[PDB]
């Protein structure tokens, strides 16, 4: 009702393991929003209501803007967010991010910004990857899609680390940063093999074809989490623009 009464749908934006995200217009503002709708078994889910509570409270220029969350009668939970016009980092990676080194670095920064904020509120994303990082109409990172059935209090295989510790997201960032700083990997066999190589237990292994990027991703991907830098610690490293 509230969904259908007050919104019109425009485009399936994505489909999750749980339920979908629909780009919609609001009747009254006329504003486009993204809306996760999840089918829900009231009493089980208590996790979810938890992560809703937990995620509502996040405010950052590098998080997707929250708007509202409600339920409609037995079934569904809706979550209304900012609709980022430039889609995902994935799209941006696949259309030649490695080319623009200036842009590459800036975005990487914004992500770190986000992770720091998340980390200092005592929180972890865990489901971090380029499909889960969006881009506003001003081409700024908006991190999102935390995972509502996933605990985010600091107490799909390629982005996960070999291990609750903030170090997990910074591993993922190395995988991500690599892809940002690399040519689009046309083949699936390519994507998969190349990244399996970044995840070499003793030491990462890279393509044959960008020198500052190496040292960073090496730091980030360190198999021992204690030799990976904090979002701020790495924001402090001299290995950085602007
Ligand atoms: N282009 C484009 N594509 C997809 C989206 C999106 C989207 C979306 C969505 F529709 C619901 C939820 C989350 N993310 S969440 O992690 O579940 C979360 C939950 C709460 Cl309650 C609060 C916050 C931060 O306050 C977060 Cl991040 C979305 F990312 C936006 N643009």
Curated annotation (Swiss-Prot):
Which superkingdom heads the taxonomic lineage of this protein's source?
Eukaryota
**Expression tissues:** Widely expressed. Expressed in lung, smooth muscle cells and macrophages.
Per the UniProt entry, the disulfide pairs are none
Phosphothreonine found at:
150, 156
Disorder association: Pulmonary venoocclusive disease 2, autosomal recessive: A disease characterized by widespread fibrous obstruction and intimal thickening of septal veins and preseptal venules, a low diffusing capacity for carbon monoxide, occult alveolar hemorrhage, and nodular ground-glass opacities, septal lines and lymph node enlargement showed by high-resolution computed tomography of the chest. It is frequently associated with pulmonary capillary dilatation and proliferation, and is a rare and devastating cause of pulmonary hypertension.
| Function noted in UniProt | Metabolic-stress sensing protein kinase that phosphorylates the alpha subunit of eukaryotic translation initiation factor 2 (EIF2S1/eIF-2-alpha) in response to low amino acid availability. Plays a role as an activator of the integrated stress response (ISR) required for adaptation to amino acid starvation. (Microbial infection) Plays a role in modulating the adaptive immune response to yellow fever virus infection; promotes dendritic cells to initiate autophagy and antigene presentation to both CD4(+) and CD8(+) T-cells under amino acid starvation.
Family as reported in the entry's similarity comment: Belongs to the protein kinase superfamily. Ser/Thr protein kinase family. GCN2 subfamily.
- Protein name in the entry: eIF-2-alpha kinase GCN2
Organism field: Homo sapiens
């Amino acid at each position: 009702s509230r969904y259908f009464i007050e919104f019109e749908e425009l485009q399936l934006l994505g489909k999750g393991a749980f339920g979908a995200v629909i780009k919609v217009q609001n009747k009254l503002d006329g504003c486009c929003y993204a809306v996760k709708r999840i089918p829900i078994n009231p009493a089980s889910f208590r996790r979810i209501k938890g992560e809703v509570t937990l995620l509502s409270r996040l405010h950052h220029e590098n998080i997707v803007r929250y708007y509202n969350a409600w339920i409609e009668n037995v079934h569904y939970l809706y979550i209304q967010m900012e609709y980022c016009e430039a889609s995902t980092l994935r799209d941006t990676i696949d259309q030649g991010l490695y080319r623009d080194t200036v842009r590459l670095w800036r975005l990487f920064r914004e992500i770190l910004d986000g992770l720091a904020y998340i980390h200092e509120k005592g929180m972890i994303h865990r489901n971090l990857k380029p499909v889960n990082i969006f881009l506003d109409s001003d081409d700024h990172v908006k991190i999102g899609d935390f995972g509502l059935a996933t605990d985010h209090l600091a107490f799909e295989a390629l982005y996960v680390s070999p291990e609750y510790n903030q170090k997990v997201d910074l591993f993922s960032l190395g995988i991500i940063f690599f892809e940002m700083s690399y040519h689009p990997m046309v083949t699936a066999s390519e994507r998969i093999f190349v990244l399996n190589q970044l995840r070499d237990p003793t030491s990462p292994k890279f393509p044959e074809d960008h020198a500052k990027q190496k040292s960073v991703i090496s730091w980030l991907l360190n198999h021992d989490p204690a030799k990976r830098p904090t979002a701020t610690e790495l924001l402090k490293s001299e290995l950085l623009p602007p």
